[PDB]
Amino acid sequence: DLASLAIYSFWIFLAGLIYYLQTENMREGYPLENEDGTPAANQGPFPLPKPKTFILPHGRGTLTVPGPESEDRPIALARTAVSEGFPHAPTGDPMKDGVGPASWVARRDLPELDGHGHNKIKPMKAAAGFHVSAGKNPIGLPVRGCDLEIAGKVVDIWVDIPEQMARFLEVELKDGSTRLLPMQMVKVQSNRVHVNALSSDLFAGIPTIKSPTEVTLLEEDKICGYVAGGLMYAAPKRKS
Amino acid sequence: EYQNIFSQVQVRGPADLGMTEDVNLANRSGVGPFSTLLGWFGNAQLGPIYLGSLGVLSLFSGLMWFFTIGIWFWYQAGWNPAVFLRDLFFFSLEPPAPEYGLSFAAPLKEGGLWLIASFFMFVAVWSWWGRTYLRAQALGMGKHTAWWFLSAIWLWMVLGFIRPILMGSWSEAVPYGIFSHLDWTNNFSLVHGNLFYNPFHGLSIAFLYGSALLFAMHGATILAVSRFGGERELEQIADRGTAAERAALFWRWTMGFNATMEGIHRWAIWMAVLVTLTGGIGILLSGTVVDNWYVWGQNHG
Amino acid sequence: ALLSFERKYRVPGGTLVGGNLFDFWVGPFYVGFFGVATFFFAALGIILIAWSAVLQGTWNPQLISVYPPALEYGLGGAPLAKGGLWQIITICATGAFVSWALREVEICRKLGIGYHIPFAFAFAILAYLTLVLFRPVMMGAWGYAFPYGIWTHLDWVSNTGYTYGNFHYNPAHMIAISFFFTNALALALHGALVLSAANPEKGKEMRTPDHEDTFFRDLVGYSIGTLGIHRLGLLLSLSAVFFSALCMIITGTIWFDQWVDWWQWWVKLPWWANIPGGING
Numbered sequence: 001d002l003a004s005l006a007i008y009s010f011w012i013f014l015a016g017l018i019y020y021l022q023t024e025n026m027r028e029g030y031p032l033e034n035e036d037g038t039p040a041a042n043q044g045p046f047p048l049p050k051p052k053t054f055i056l057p058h059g060r061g062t063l064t065v066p067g068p069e070s071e072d073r074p075i076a077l078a079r080t081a082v083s084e085g086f087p088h089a090p091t092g093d094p095m096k097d098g099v100g101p102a103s104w105v106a107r108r109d110l111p112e113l114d115g116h117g118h119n120k121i122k123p124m125k126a127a128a129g130f131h132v133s134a135g136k137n138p139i140g141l142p143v144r145g146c147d148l149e150i151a152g153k154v155v156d157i158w159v160d161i162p163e164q165m166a167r168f169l170e171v172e173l174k175d176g177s178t179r180l181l182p183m184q185m186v187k188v189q190s191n192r193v194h195v196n197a198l199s200s201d202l203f204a205g206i207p208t209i210k211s212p213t214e215v216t217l218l219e220e221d222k223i224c225g226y227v228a229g230g231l232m233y234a235a236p237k238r239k240s
Numbered sequence: 241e242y243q244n245i246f247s248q249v250q251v252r253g254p255a256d257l258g259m260t261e262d263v264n265l266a267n268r269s270g271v272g273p274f275s276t277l278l279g280w281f282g283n284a285q286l287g288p289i290y291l292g293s294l295g296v297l298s299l300f301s302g303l304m305w306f307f308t309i310g311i312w313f314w315y316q317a318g319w320n321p322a323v324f325l326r327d328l329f330f331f332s333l334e335p336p337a338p339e340y341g342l343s344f345a346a347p348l349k350e351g352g353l354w355l356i357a358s359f360f361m362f363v364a365v366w367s368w369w370g371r372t373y374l375r376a377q378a379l380g381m382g383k384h385t386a387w388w389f390l391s392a393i394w395l396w397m398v399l400g401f402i403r404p405i406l407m408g409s410w411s412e413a414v415p416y417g418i419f420s421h422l423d424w425t426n427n428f429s430l431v432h433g434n435l436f437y438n439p440f441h442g443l444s445i446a447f448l449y450g451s452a453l454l455f456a457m458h459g460a461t462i463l464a465v466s467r468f469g470g471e472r473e474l475e476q477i478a479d480r481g482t483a484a485e486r487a488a489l490f491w492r493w494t495m496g497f498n499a500t501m502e503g504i505h506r507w508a509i510w511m512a513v514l515v516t517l518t519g520g521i522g523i524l525l526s527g528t529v530v531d532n533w534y535v536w537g538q539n540h541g
Numbered sequence: 542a543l544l545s546f547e548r549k550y551r552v553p554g555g556t557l558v559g560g561n562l563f564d565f566w567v568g569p570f571y572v573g574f575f576g577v578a579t580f581f582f583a584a585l586g587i588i589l590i591a592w593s594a595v596l597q598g599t600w601n602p603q604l605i606s607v608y609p610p611a612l613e614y615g616l617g618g619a620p621l622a623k624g625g626l627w628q629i630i631t632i633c634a635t636g637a638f639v640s641w642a643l644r645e646v647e648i649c650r651k652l653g654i655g656y657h658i659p660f661a662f663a664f665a666i667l668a669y670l671t672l673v674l675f676r677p678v679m680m681g682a683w684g685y686a687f688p689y690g691i692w693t694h695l696d697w698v699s700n701t702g703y704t705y706g707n708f709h710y711n712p713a714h715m716i717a718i719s720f721f722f723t724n725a726l727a728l729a730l731h732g733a734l735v736l737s738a739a740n741p742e743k744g745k746e747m748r749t750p751d752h753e754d755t756f757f758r759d760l761v762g763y764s765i766g767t768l769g770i771h772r773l774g775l776l777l778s779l780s781a782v783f784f785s786a787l788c789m790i791i792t793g794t795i796w797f798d799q800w801v802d803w804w805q806w807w808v809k810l811p812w813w814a815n816i817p818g819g820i821n822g
């Protein structure tokens with residue numbers, strides 16, 4: 001019976017498809033590790049896929065995955081138990097050390113480029129033709145932290161040029177230096193920008209960027225991780 | 241409390257006229273207008289659009305399909321616009337009766353117009369498919385969109401072309417009408433012994449439900465990690481970031497396994513492809529090989 | 542037992558209940574208070590199904606079915622063999638799903654991510670609860686809920702639909718379907734688009750999101766963008782389930798006649814009701 005053959009054949013196909021999909025999804029993060037970073041005995045029932053190579057644009061080289069995985073940074077955490085499966089405590093200030101929800105990845109220390117090889121994200125003042133087209137313009141608004149104190153003032157939008165979107169607010173602090181805050185972590189109001197994730201005293205610790213007119217993928221990850229981290233680690237300073 | 245569902249502040253710069261690669265620029269329109277409305281949720285920019293010969297063919301046929309059905313509707317309304325609006329969902333352009341088999345000998349008012357409408361649809365859809373292939377090729381991209389589109393075209397072809405041919409008449413095809421095609425769908429199941437006993441119908445539902453499950457999961461996940469640039473998925477594939485790691489670990493910790501920024505899109509395309517792939521198979525087998533799924537299920541064969 | 546990049550994220554904190562008492566993992570799985578809760582509810586539920594299996598007769602998963610109390614019990618409790626097991630299992634199921642969502646919230650908090658995932662899951666839970674709790678309660682009996690059986694729950698679907706004729710004519714149902722179909726279309730297009738940029742023609746460089754915008758502008762005259770598409774998928778999927786729940790909560794309550802007849806309200810509008818010709822004249 002043709003329908004019987006069809007359904008039988010389909011289930012065989014589906015099993016192979018799932019096997020394929022799972023192995024494709026092991027191209028990052030595997031082989032699995034013990035807590036001490038050595039290879040785990042149990043790697044699961046799926047073998048690693050054969051490597052593929054992505055050719056990156058603008059002379060950025062290639063990425064071959066799977067390949068040798070390394071964190072490429074120190075991780076300031078220590079065991080809290082004598083057996084596997086428990087949390088690892090920050091050995092210093094987790095916001096400063098970039099662990100837990102304050103974590104960052106050692107991404108490339110160059111900016112993301114657009115299709116024409118220009119920096120994807122620029123301050124709006126250096127972005128020709130770009131302006132606020134709708135909504136409250138945050139530039140000039142005071143910035144308030146979760147302690148309900150003013151941490152600084154908005155002095156520009158960082159904009160994604162190809163995707164024409166606001167990505168960061170640039171905030172000037174009391175000392176005249178500036179930091180980037182992710183646009184997804186601020187609330188633009190009529191009279192202020194409010195940031196729940198950080199108290200005013202934590203704004204100075206936001207990682208700085210090397211150049212005034214560009215931000216690298218490494219810098220973005222440090223900024224974004226730090227700000228997200230404040231939701232856990234600034235909680236005693238967050239007025240409710 | 242900001243959730244990134246709607247943008248708080250829109251920015252606009254010069255119109256993005258796009259990447260060139262091997263695209264024939266003479267066939268691109270100018271940019272359209274900018275919609276502030278759209279811009280709250282997605283991109284504000286409309287256009288440009290590429291319109292070569294194959295696209296003009298596709299659009300023309302599509303409109304001719306639409307207008308052919310419309311003219312029949314107006315006729316059924318007695319050319320009265322009040323009756324046209326009143327009975328809009330009730331009008332139907334119906335295929336030829338079984339007597340005419342697979343021939344084109346049926347009169348205009350008794351199947352002929354349905355064949356004309358269907359011809360225009362056939363050309364519209366297939367030319368749109370070539371265009372999906374060709375726009376990818378001009379940009380040097382993979383053909384995934386065209387391969388997926390083929391799985392959807394499969395179900396459509398089975399319903400209106402392949403199954404009717406195998407069943408020996410155009411009368412087996414779907415009519416063009418809002419209520420009538422729902423009536424046809426209900427009837428199709430009744431006549432074939434209840435489609436809930438068709439295992440490919442069951443699978444098709446699994447994947448349809450599964451597509452909503454998966455896009456809810458993925459959409460939510462990416463919005464949840466958008467505070468780390470998560471939606472920039474191509475660069476996250478090329479150079480994994482904390483967005484990609486937190487996304488994976490959410491799912492690893494929740495359900496004990498996870499995806500990658502690239503691999504989740506393979507889950508995505510296949511979940512959705514399999515809806516229409518299994519679906520077309522289920523419909524094609526109905527009446528050609530299996531007259532009654534309940535009966536088949538009792539055997540099974 | 543960890544991903545290569547995982548250890549730095551496995552810090553204490555984020556729990557909503559219990560402090561550090563259940564702040565740990567088993568293999569890949571995070572536990573927490575709600576992990577313990579989910580286990581308790583899921584285990585009790587499955588045990589009660591496995592036992593109901595025996596009171597029914599069978600151990601074939603294609604035969605096992607736990608039916609709600611008969612309509613004569615109304616909204617009361619029922620003996621275990623005659624609906625009570627269904628009632629207890631439904632409490633366990635709700636407990637399991639809700640505990641699963643709250644566990645997801647604990648995981649979001651530890652990872653420093655938004656709550657969008659458990660928020661989205663809550664739509665599914667509410668759809669489930671519409672069918673087994675809200676609708677049955679509004680109709681005055683647990684017996685209107687669906688039975689827990691692989692094939693028997695499909696019997697309930699056609700039985701329930703055909704109570705109102707062709708259920709296609711439920712307008713909220715039409716909208717629900719349109720969102721399900723459009724969601725699957727958007728999922729296809731999104732998966733294909735990203736993969737077409739990440740996996741270009743042999744030997745070529747990875748494309749950029751600019752190429753993704755360009756592809757769709759060339760094709761349809763518009764690109765929603767990389768942020769937009771994820772918002773859209775979430776919207777379409779949640780809207781599908783919202784309208785599903787709606788299409789059922791109004792059925793047997795506000796509207797209980799043949800759904801096809803609802804549409805006569807439009808046809809009978811005074812200005813065209815009696816104009817001759819067409820289908821309805």
Ligand code: BCL
Nearest residue numbers: 425426428429435436440441444445448519520522523722
């Ligand atoms: C009483 C009716 C029968 C029944 C009869 C059928 C029949 C007959 C068929 C299905 C099919 C399907 N059914 Mg069934 N179905 C029933 C009960 C159900 C139930 C349920 C909860 O009870 C569910 C969830 C489903 C679910 C499904 C889907 C999984 C599947 C269609 C996939 C898809 O994307 O199609 C949509 C795909 C399309 C190509 C059409 C939609 C077009 C696109 C997506 C939208 C474009 C619209 C555009 C924007 C506007 C155009 C302009 C207008 C012309 C004005 N059915 C009952 C038992 N069902 C199909 C299938 O595959 O079966 C195996 C099919 O042929």
Ligand code: BCL
Nearest residue numbers: 441442443445446447449450453587669672687691692698
């Ligand atoms: C949603 C509207 C109707 C309904 C209409 C239909 C129709 C119509 C069909 C199904 C089908 C299925 N339904 Mg149902 N179904 C409903 C409510 C439910 C509920 C619930 C708790 O509310 C569950 C768990 C299921 C489960 C299922 C699966 C057995 C099957 C495939 C679904 C799927 O892949 O989804 C998407 C999800 C995924 C892809 C993730 C995987 C989910 C797995 C498959 C769930 C397995 C559940 C397990 C067998 C039972 C519980 C396990 C306990 C530990 C004991 N249905 C409501 C009442 N359902 C299809 C079938 O083939 O039935 C025989 C089918 O044709």
Ligand code: BCL
Nearest residue numbers: 396399414418421425709712714715716718719720722723
């Ligand atoms: C798959 C099995 C059957 C089938 C079964 C069904 C079923 C069942 C349904 C449809 C529905 C639709 N089908 Mg069909 N359909 C089939 C094949 C097709 C094909 C084809 C080329 O193969 C086409 C073009 C269509 C076309 C359509 C559209 C007219 C319509 C919804 C489209 C949509 O997703 O909009 C996307 C739009 C949105 C996501 C936004 C939401 C708004 C939309 C427009 C809702 C419209 C419904 C109605 C007018 C609302 C009334 C409420 C009042 C406002 C109060 N069908 C096959 C033959 N189809 C649905 C419908 O509405 O029919 C009337 C429906 O319930």
Ligand code: BCL
Nearest residue numbers: 665666668669698699701702707708709717718785786789
């Ligand atoms: C003869 C039958 C009638 C009909 C009668 C009905 C009836 C009756 C119902 C629907 C419902 C639906 N129908 Mg209808 N329907 C018909 C024809 C169709 C057609 C078609 C192409 O013809 C389509 C596309 C649909 C489409 C739909 C959907 C809009 C909706 C189902 C989705 C839903 O509720 O998800 C919601 C999702 C859930 C309920 C899943 C919840 C999952 C829970 C929270 C988690 C479970 C975990 C689980 C236990 C797994 C754990 C174990 C493992 C680890 C996995 N119908 C025909 C005409 N339809 C249903 C609806 O709208 O329900 C609200 C409904 O009750």
Ligand SMILES: CC[C@H]1c2cc3[nH]c4c(c3C)C(=O)[C@H](C(=O)OC)c4c3nc(cc4[nH]c(cc(n2)[C@@H]1C)c(C(C)=O)c4C)[C@@H](C)[C@@H]3CCC(=O)OC/C=C(\C)CCC[C@H](C)CCC[C@H](C)CCCC(C)C
Nearest residue numbers: 449452453456583586634637641661662664665689690691
């Ligand atoms: C709201 C939009 C869509 C959606 C979203 C969604 N679902 C989700 C999520 C989200 C965002 C999750 O985060 C969560 C998840 O972890 O996914 C991997 C989940 C989930 N969606 C699931 C299933 C599922 N979702 C569905 C639907 C949908 N989910 C929508 C279409 C469907 C159907 C039928 O369409 C199913 C079957 C699970 C995979 C997972 C939730 C897992 C969970 O709750 O685990 C804890 C509970 C258990 C492990 C077991 C409980 C056992 C019970 C005590 C006994 C069984 C009783 C049951 C009622 C019997 C049913 C018998 C059937 C034959 C009817």
Ligand SMILES: COC(C)(C)C(=O)C/C=C(\C)CC/C=C(\C)CC/C=C(\C)CCCC/C(C)=C/CCC(C)CC/C=C(\C)CCC=C(C)C
Nearest residue numbers: 307309310358359362396397399400401414416417418421
């Ligand atoms: C406002 O008034 C004007 C006149 C301006 C209008 O424009 C009005 C227009 C309308 C009122 C339009 C209304 C349109 C509809 C209601 C359309 C409804 C359409 C459907 C519900 C379609 C559903 C399903 C169709 C399917 C499955 C068709 C499949 C077709 C095929 C696979 C093609 C088969 C080809 C054939 C049979 C011929 C092939 C012959 C060759 C030689 C190749």
Ligand SMILES: CCCCCCCCCCCC[N+](C)(C)[O-]
Nearest residue numbers: 018022032043044045046496497
């Ligand atoms: C329909 C969804 C399919 C579920 C797929 C289940 C496979 C998950 C097993 C992955 C094991 C993880 N390991 C052990 C590879 O890390």
Ligand SMILES: CCCCCCCCCCCC[N+](C)(C)[O-]
Nearest residue numbers: 439440442443446450507510511
């Ligand atoms: C992307 C693939 C993962 C999804 C796996 C879906 C399995 C659904 C099982 C339903 C089987 C019903 N049938 C078809 C036996 O009636």
Ligand SMILES: CCCCCCCCCCCC
Nearest residue numbers: 044495496497498568569570
């Ligand atoms: C659809 C069948 C449910 C599949 C459940 C898979 C559970 C995977 C656990 C992974 C352990 C590491």
Ligand SMILES: [Cl-]
Nearest residue numbers: 372389730760
């Ligand atoms: Cl398309």
Ligand SMILES: [Fe+3]
Nearest residue numbers: 458462473731
């Ligand atoms: Fe994505």
